[PDB]
Amino acid sequence: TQELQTRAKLLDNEIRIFRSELQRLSHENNVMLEKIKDNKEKIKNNRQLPYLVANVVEVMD
């Protein structure tokens, strides 16, 4: 009855760590996504019709 209740006090504090971590990762996701959105718009300008049509003789690679 000591060990089981001291485990409940352990599980209370665990929440704090969990909230603290979760938040950090969530703002990181938003930041990274925006950087993709700007890069995508420049790609959009070039892709805009008309464009030269060609054929690839070979890829050296």
């Binding site: 019709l49 008309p50 464009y51 030269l52 049509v53």
Partner: peptide, 16 residues
């Protein structure tokens, strides 16, 4: 006709 259009110009230049 491609579901745009491929034109062929008389100088033989291809464009969508």
């Amino acid at each position: 006709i491609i579901k745009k259009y491929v034109i062929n110009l008389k100088q033989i230049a291809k464009f969508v």
